[PDB]
């Protein structure tokens, strides 16, 4: 509810990288909360957006994107080269219970660390 | 790569529910692998599909859906009432390194168990 400084822990290929986030307000036009890493240049900030919805049927989505940049020799400022987009979209109904909603997110969260997807993302192997 | 019987562990609101999956072949029309729980009636099966792509830019998606059903009194067979859809879509580029790809999935996997999203999914509170 009251969004705060969410800090992750032990993430990315070795468990040796941490991450902090700071809130960056709520966009009143569409109700999308944002979180960002306190970087140096605001163009280079690992951004995480989250938005629940209202009715039809319920809808939750999380859009997370990380840019990487390299210093082009023709300029002094760094320029953004590429991103890595990702997003989840949960869709429930009016009659969804609490346990049945929690089952989905915990299944997805534990399935993202399976020996299937670590081969399907880090090396892009099909099945 | 070689997909096998993926078993999860300690998932959903208490850590007391486990889950097993069995492979159900690869659809040759679009290259979408499938996994399912060995249920009684095949209409009631918690299904998990995963598909990496090829080029443009790379694309990985995981579509997971769980149905729930109740026995209507007018019939003997159970009928499906509602689902709980979910899907992730990772998008990388040609020049994405290994570490930078793993960072995204581990950040998402550890962020799905934050004290932010457990309030944003299990009670659907906004921020």
């Amino acid at each position: 509810a009251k969004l705060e400084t969410v800090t992750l822990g032990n993430i990315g290929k070795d468990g040796k990288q941490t991450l902090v986030l700071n809130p960056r307000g709520v966009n009143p036009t569409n109700g999308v909360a944002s979180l960002s890493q306190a970087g140096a240049v605001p163009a280079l900030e690992k951004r995480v957006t989250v938005s629940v919805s209202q009715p039809k049927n319920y809808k939750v989505q999380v859009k997370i994107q990380n840019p990487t940049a390299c210093t082009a020799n023709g300029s002094c400022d760094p320029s953004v080269t590429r991103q890595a987009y990702a997003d989840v979209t949960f869709s429930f109904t009016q009659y969804s219970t609490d346990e049945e909603r929690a089952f989905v997110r915990t299944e997805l969260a534990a399935l993202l660390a399976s020996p299937l997807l670590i081969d399907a993302i880090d090396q892009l192997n099909p099945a | 790569a070689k997909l096998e019987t993926v078993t999860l562990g300690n998932i959903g609101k208490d850590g007391k529910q486990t889950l097993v999956l069995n492979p159900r072949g690869v659809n040759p029309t679009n290259g979408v692998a499938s996994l399912s729980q060995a249920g009684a009636v095949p209409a009631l099966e918690k299904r998990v599909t995963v598909s990496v792509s090829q080029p443009k830019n790379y694309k990985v998606q995981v579509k997971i859906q769980n149905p729930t059903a109740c026995t209507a009194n007018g019939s003997c067979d159970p009928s499906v009432t509602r689902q709980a859809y979910a899907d992730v879509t990772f998008s990388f580029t040609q020049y994405s390194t290994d570490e930078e790809r793993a960072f995204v999935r581990t950040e998402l996997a550890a962020l799905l168990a934050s004290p932010l999203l457990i309030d944003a999914i299990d009670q659907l509170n906004p921020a």
């Epitope: 800090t7 032990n10 941490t18 969260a109 | -």
Partner: antibody, heavy 98, light 94 residues
Framework: VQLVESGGGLVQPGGSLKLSCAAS????????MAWVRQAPRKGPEWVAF????????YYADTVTGRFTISRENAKNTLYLYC?????????????WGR | VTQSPASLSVATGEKVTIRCITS??????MNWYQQKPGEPPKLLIS???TLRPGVPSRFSSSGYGTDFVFTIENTLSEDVADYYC?????????
């Protein structure tokens, strides 16, 4: 800012215990932690490093029971020495309990 | 897989060499704790050469993958206690 262990001392061979460990002002989020006790002959034993968010868990070679769990209700951890790592993600750790 | 040399004290006015050698891989991170016989231990200069405050500047180490040397100073003060070495790779991590 400290942190203190608690637990039994006369367990029967075959049974099990539940070590408790309470925090004292590092807010018990934001920070990973671990269990390591010692024999009376040698100090640094195994590690069962918990995540910050109870996501990345792993136990050491002596895994038969010995489950680590973290609950942010009374800032304690349950387990069936109690140390914690620093702010940056790493695997060294600095503060200790008795 | 780590290893430290045998127990020694020599004198109360000299340095002492402690060799942490590791046969698994190459490491940039190798930490040192000290165990006085009254309390649970306390770290020092870990991640190579950080030297977190609370410990005096007399302590030192150097090294790299598969070789680390730890040494202090001459006229080293009293109340010796044993020193332990461990690592931050390979999740059991000794």
């Amino acid at each position: 800012v400290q942190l203190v262990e608690s637990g039994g001392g006369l367990v029967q061979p075959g049974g099990s215990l539940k070590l408790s460990c309470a925090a004292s002002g590092f807010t018990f989020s934001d920070y990973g932690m671990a269990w390591v006790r010692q024999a009376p002959r040698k100090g640094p034993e195994w590690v069962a490093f918990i995540s910050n968010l109870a996501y990345s868990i792993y136990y050491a070679d002596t895994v038969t029971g010995r489950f680590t769990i973290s609950r942010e209700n009374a800032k304690n951890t349950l387990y069936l020495y109690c140390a914690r790592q620093n702010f940056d993600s790493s695997f060294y750790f600095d503060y200790w309990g008795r | 897989v780590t290893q430290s040399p045998a127990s020694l004290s020599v004198a109360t006015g000299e340095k002492v060499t402690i060799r942490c050698i590791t046969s698994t891989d190459i490491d940039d991170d190798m930490n040192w704790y000290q165990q006085k016989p009254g309390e649970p231990p306390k770290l020092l200069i870990s991640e190579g050469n950080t030297l977190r405050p609370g410990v005096p500047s007399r302590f030192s180490s150097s090294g790299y993958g598969t070789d680390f040397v730890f040494t202090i100073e001459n006229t080293l003060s009293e109340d010796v206690a044993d020193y332990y070495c461990l690592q931050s790779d390979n999740m059991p991590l000794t």
